[PDB]
Amino acid sequence: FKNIDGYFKIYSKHTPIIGRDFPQGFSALEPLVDLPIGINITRFQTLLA
Amino acid sequence: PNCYFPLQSYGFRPTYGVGHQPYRVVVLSFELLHAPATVCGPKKSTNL
Numbered sequence: 001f002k003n004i005d006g007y008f009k010i011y012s013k014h015t016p017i018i019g020r021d022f023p024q025g026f027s028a029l030e031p032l033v034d035l036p037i038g039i040n041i042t043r044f045q046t047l048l049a
Numbered sequence: 050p051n052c053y054f055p056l057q058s059y060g061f062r063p064t065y066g067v068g069h070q071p072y073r074v075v076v077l078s079f080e081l082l083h084a085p086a087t088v089c090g091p092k093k094s095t096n097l
């Protein structure tokens with residue numbers, strides 16, 4: 001995710017997990033959505049289940 | 050007397066003069082400033 005001039009951009013790519021959690025082979029990342037947020041993103045948090 | 054209710058009515062009937070008819074007024078306010086565009090016009094497309 002990034003917040004250049006607003007316009008929040010999200011890029012995602014799901015790879016069937018291999019033996020290594022965060023391995024090393026290359027994996028491209030594709031955009032999913034880009035919509036004009038326009039707020040001062042400074043803090044970040046996650047949700048659980 | 051000397052004690053007036055703040056609001057009065059727009060009593061409307063099918064028979065007045067033009068200046069007293071129930072005109073329907075809708076005003077559109079735009080924000081044409083430097084900000085990310087959200088509402089745009091009907092851009093026209095054509096053949097190939």
Ligand SMILES: *[C@@H]1O[C@H](CO)[C@@H](O)[C@H](O)[C@H]1NC(C)=O
Nearest residue numbers: 005006037038039040041084
């Ligand atoms: C926060 O984002 C808005 C979006 O335009 C901007 O006006 C404002 O300058 C930003 N805050 C700061 C400190 O730059």
